Amino acid sequence: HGNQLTAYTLRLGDNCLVLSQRLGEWCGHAPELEIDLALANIGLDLLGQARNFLSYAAELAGEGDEDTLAFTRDERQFSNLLLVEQPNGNFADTIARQYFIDAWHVALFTRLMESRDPQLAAISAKAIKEARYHLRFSRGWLERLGNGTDVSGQKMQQAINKLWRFTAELFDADEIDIALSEEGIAVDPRTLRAAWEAEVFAGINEATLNVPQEQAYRTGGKKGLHTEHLGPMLAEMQYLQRVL
């Protein structure tokens, strides 16, 4: 059971760490200073939550710390969702990725605040506040791009379409999710789908765009099975740790 809790805690931290790294790559390349500052702020919030989760996972494991966990594991040991390791692409692609994960975070942390694990509950109490601001930002830009010129609307629709194949993974429950949720410790991913859709489907329509059709999807992140993008990203992250 200790291993299950460690793995659960670590994957939540991995999601934050990986996304944080992607947002960091935007620094100095955003369309405006305002956007550049917002993305850096979200990345910093995510890095902080990554520290909290990894720190707790190292404690549970009885060895290492947030740094050993963040910088000494190769992709096979990373357990983040595939959605956060995807390339930044254009601003629209980054906005779609952010909105999907932000809506997920708000739903997750809202429920995880009730966790019988006091540390997970405490972390969620702080993360929920950050997630709400992220969502306000990502949903706001989704709306603005979708309601802008048809060209920006097309770019926003395309971003939504290409990243939709990574949304289903957010709602599948594995053995760890099931065991820990029956214990009132973890949130059953399956139970977050309704809240996510209510937010996302509404946001997409209010941006005057279409919700993609459900199709076969990509998965494996929580089991250490990733896309070709994570490896290179981790090498970069580890390098930046050495030089900066």
**Annotated binding residues for substrate, as ranges?**
77-80, 178-180
Size of residue set near its own copies by CB under 8 A:
22
184 binds its own copies (CB under 8 A): no
Shortest Å distance, C-beta 15 to its own copies:
18
For residue 117 the two structure tokens come to 């694990």
The identity of residue 165, as a single letter, is R
* Contacting range for its own copies; rule: CB under 8 A; set: 24-32, 98-106, 124-132, 158-166: 24-32
244 binds its own copies (CB under 8 A): yes
Q: Which residues of 157-177 are buried (b: 16+ CB within 10 A; e: fewer)?
A: bbbbebbbbbbbbbbebeebb
Please provide the DSSP assignment of 50-92 as one string.
HHHHHHHHHHHHTS--HHHHHHS--GGG----GGGGS---SHH
Q: How far apart are the first and last CA of the chain?
A: 38
Q: Are the beta carbons of 96 and 163 closer than 8 angstroms?
A: yes
Distance CA 39, CA 98 (A): 10
Distance CA 155, CA 89 (A): 11
Orientation angle between helical segments 33-61 and 118-146, nearest 10 degrees: 160
Measured from the CB atom, the residue of 31 and 87 that comes closer to its own copies is: 87
28 binds its own copies (CB under 8 A): yes
Measured from the CB atom, the residue of 151 and 244 that comes closer to its own copies is: 244
Measured from the CB atom, the residue of 56 and 91 that comes closer to its own copies is: 91
227 binds its own copies (CB under 8 A): no
239 binds its own copies (CB under 8 A): yes
35 binds its own copies (CB under 8 A): no
67 binds its own copies (CB under 8 A): no
Measured from the CB atom, the residue of 87 and 184 that comes closer to its own copies is: 87
40 binds its own copies (CB under 8 A): yes
Rg (CA), the chain: 17
Q: Are the beta carbons of 80 and 11 closer than 8 angstroms?
A: yes
Q: Which residues of 6-34 are buried (b: 16+ CB within 10 A; e: fewer)?
A: bbbbbbbbbbbbbbbbbbbebeeebeeee
32 binds its own copies (CB under 8 A): no
240 binds its own copies (CB under 8 A): yes
Measured from the CB atom, the residue of 216 and 244 that comes closer to its own copies is: 244
Measured from the CB atom, the residue of 218 and 229 that comes closer to its own copies is: 229
In the set 25, 59, 174, 183, which binds its own copies (CB under 8 A)?
Answer: 25
Q: By the criterion CB under 8 A, which residues form the site for its own copies?
A: 24-29, 33, 37, 40, 43, 87-88, 229, 232-233, 235-236, 239-240, 242-244
